[PDB]
Assembly symmetry: D3
Homo-oligomer: 237 residues x 6
């Protein structure tokens, strides 16, 4: 057991899908995994392990924000033998050509957090996903006939940002989705020696104020899950 996960080595697969919402983790386990078993509920942060097409897979929530997901991803990597983390999240769009439910793949993640500056002597660490995992997700999406854009996410510390003008800057620099975790997970993967990828579903448009409901995010973002799971199978080859 670790301070935030009451489980033992072997309870998790070597690949873990991670939504921010533990209820989404529950939905994923019930809907996509066979013979799923709950392996953690410390702090209500539900985690499960089962199989997808014979392949051992885990899914567990990581909570909201870089500091929360940094705890869970670290513990999984250092104490549970986890080799790959695939965040399956939601995000808000700033670009005009992006619609609700669009799937975006974060090859990189910008951020206004200080965590990577703390790691990297106050320089610019380019928080990037593992290339093979990106390519696996792209290929899986194509086989599924699901459109997906690959590019930069922005990982915000403040969902309610006092700096509205920063969204103009994100838009200028082609940011595909604003979420709150990717850059931190990528920093953890590099620090602790594992691999990670974030895929998000657009659940809000920051300009139009169109948005999906909480229930929709919890139980209807199926495209990104299929992409994530099928991408794992590709990586195994």
């Amino acid at each position: 057991a670790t301070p935030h996960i009451n489980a033992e080595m072997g309870d998790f697969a070597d690949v873990v899908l991670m939504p921010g919402d533990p209820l989404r983790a529950k939905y994923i386990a019930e809907t996509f995994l066979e013979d799923a078993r709950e392996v953690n509920n410390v702090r209500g942060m539900l985690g499960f392990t089962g199989t997808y097409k014979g392949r051992k897979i885990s899914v567990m929530g990581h909570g909201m924000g870089i500091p929360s997901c940094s705890i869970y991803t670290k513990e999984l990597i250092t104490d549970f033998g986890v080799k790959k983390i695939i965040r399956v999240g939601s995000c808000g769009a700033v670009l005009p050509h992006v619609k609700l439910r669009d799937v975006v793949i974060g090859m990189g993640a910008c951020t206004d957090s200080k965590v990577n500056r703390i790691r990297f002597k106050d320089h610019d660490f380019a928080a990037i996903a593992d290339f093979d995992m990106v390519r696996n997700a792209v290929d899986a999406a194509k086989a599924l006939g699901i459109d997906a854009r690959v590019g930069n996410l922005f990982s915000a510390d403040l969902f309610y940002s006092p700096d509205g003008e920063m969204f103009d800057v994100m838009e200028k620099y082609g940011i595909l989705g604003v979420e709150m975790e990717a850059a931190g997970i990528y920093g953890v993967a590099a620090e602790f020696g594992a691999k990670a990828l974030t895929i998000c579903t657009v659940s809000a448009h920051i300009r139009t104020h169109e948005q999906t409901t909480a229930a929709e995010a919890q139980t209807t973002f199926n495209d990104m899950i299929k992409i994530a799971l099928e991408s794992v199978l590709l990586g195994d080859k």
Copy 2:
């Protein structure tokens, strides 16, 4: 009625106690409140409203880290009429004279987060509690025969810090407890014109690695909750 809280105005009291762990919110409601009812379960972040000695009180988890708790506190203040937030948590000590089970009140909170610099034009915002709430808590503790230390907390972005050296710095500058939320909550309170206070119990000593019993640790945790609840009654005057 917000993306993270499925409740309506009136469902929350004008004061909310907030532990990090939603399971601990349920614990507090069951233990200390009469007629508590669940008012939120989005993302598993349980919230409850009941009464303490006839006074309407809410309790709801805030999740781990500044970004998580910043979402919930903002929404409570702007959308649910909440006037006071009291974070009730655990912290780690760095000072030799601060002991396991000491109760510490964060009149201020240092941080390595960038959120207040973003708010405050890259200058130093002193993230502080509301003075009247601090002295209500000090007085409630005194009435319960519990001494509480008042001073600075440090709100960390990284529970697993790569910078081992920062703990010596915290010790040098007299930090009473290390946690992950206070400076963010204080920043939200200032930004949105509300009042906040963080009280913590020392659950670990980053130095001594001291030991207590579960019974004693749980007693002190309950004492902290009683301090928080009684402090509200004093403020109501």
Copy 3:
């Protein structure tokens, strides 16, 4: 003796009142202290030691700005056994409801100085007063029929700031008064393990230069000094 104070251990009380204007020290000594003796004259920064209602008190100016007051407060603490510093001075207000002649107590002090970032590994140190000293001053003021406001000061490096927009930011975040010392004194207090408090009287509104008649200014100055001195007696407990 120290580089800026020609005195020996014992020449200063364990509590020192510090105005910015060095001319105020002799005034305070003659008007409020009994049996005062001169204990410093280096650079014209006159210091005196006497008693107030039997209690040993010293008074000496600190000069304008963080670097000046940081020198005197450090030397007093490390070489003269001083345990408490009370800065007594003026501030300018940015809040429309904060009035000329209001007494404000800096529980915290924001700043645009780099001194605390230098101390605190470039993170956010919450520069705070000693809580008991704050409460003592609040209680002393109340007994004199004065309602003091407690909250954040802003300690500016530039009295003539080229950033006009910062005053609006200060206002938004509830800053009670703008002065030039508190954050520095609070930083020294934390660095060297002592206790400090800044009390200010509002002498100006930053944006509209209405002023106070000299007679009203002297009356309010005397009130502030009485609050400071009586607060010490309450602290002796």
Copy 4:
């Protein structure tokens, strides 16, 4: 003509290979392009246009450092219709498993430059290559039977860095090569709306002090050129 390029729209292909060394650009044109014509020599920064397997291609030096290459890439994008920039550079390795002449592909680029902070409101911009271009280079290398690692480069402002310890940090974070341009080119591509990729040949090992000669870098780094050119043909499909 632009301030640093004496040519007109149409003189450059829509894809430009860019080594730092204009003499390497000359070598590339002579060795790999047919019917090459010199289209610029302002400041000795030689640029050429010819064909590779029937495909119009340009090659031009960009000079050393982010500020130098930022000028040339900008002008090409805004005034010469250039759509893709492929930097074909040299770099120094910090990882033990990396050898002289190894080819590395920079999907991302870390940096100690301030240029991206200036663009991105002092936040962390993840300076990333275009994904399709990365994938094209990976596929071309595989078809050529040439090994290539994909990951982060570090773009240094100081070839002679006074901070030797930063190399330990780069090594910890898996940096594949230290060069001086990638992060700046990626910033320009995003700012001015084009696509870019940096491929480098390891020409020095920062730990072992093994290094190739100036002449070798000028006229013998053929693997990376073949990869770059063949990757273009893949992208055209």
Copy 5:
């Protein structure tokens, strides 16, 4: 009148000598100026105006630290028509070949203050003296048989710096003297379109507290004042 100087336009010469120690102003006026009249006494910061060899000169102390001297120099320039400020003071040396009683002239001033970053959009402003004033002082010293060193001062915010390692960095980069004002005065001069120079006499080695006899210190002080005054006459040209 201005907030810190009770005088009117014309009361000050267009050139003002400023010692840090306010007691030095009266000394300079009595010892070096003819027909001196008192022109300020606010906060005990005595100012005088007289003539030196027929030329109008004023002298007034500036207090310790950037924030203090920034107030006086700003008011003198904007409200009293002052064109040149010469700070005359002491510094501590870090270079082994810089000796006690050496005269040093700050052509530039490094700093750990944030004031110039606040002015200069967080970039590096090179805080510099007026070149002609520097050369005038060099020439005036030469005519008095004194060889002055010209180079960088370092203007510290903290006389008692917790960063001991910074003195070695200062030494490495050739800093001639450590004081507390020059960078601030130079910043004000640039902001308000005037000219400034800091001249210092070495009174200490930072690392080994050997000192100068009071008689030697007064002799060297007089030499510095004579250099300053004669430099003005050379500047009149």
Copy 6:
């Protein structure tokens, strides 16, 4: 004998003039030196050594930007015994009274580069020229009947800045010319214990868009070179 300079000790004079453009180095050697011979051609960065009025002098391009010129100047100083670097370049003016063809001497150089912060523990290093070289250049200009302005340059990382507002800031703080190298060269000189000076001719006015003739512009450029060469002869004394 270095990766960027194929020459041996003795091939360079102890003073090197450096324009940005290697073709301009060749121009200077042909125009002003006797018996000039090429001593470097690596990366096309032409360098030459010849005599001026019997005095051995070298001239070599430094490329555009701080990172490029930092490589060449460091190597000249540490590997080729060079004692003095004189950058001879062009700059853009922001001040209305600074005119096309004015000669400006950079006694200091501001910058938006991070290189000096990296050197100087993240504080403000005032990047300055060698005082004696500045006054040699001023005197040489006077002897040629050319008035030269001495003050601050601004060394930009981005020739194409996204921050249009910085030019107003440069103007406000009195910057004489905008170029791309001086602060980097001055930082190198300080780091490695050598001496440097940047002289520029105003070739563009970022405001007026003034016009001159090519003949007149080229005359002034040659005057600047003569100032540089004659300044060396004065320093030799």
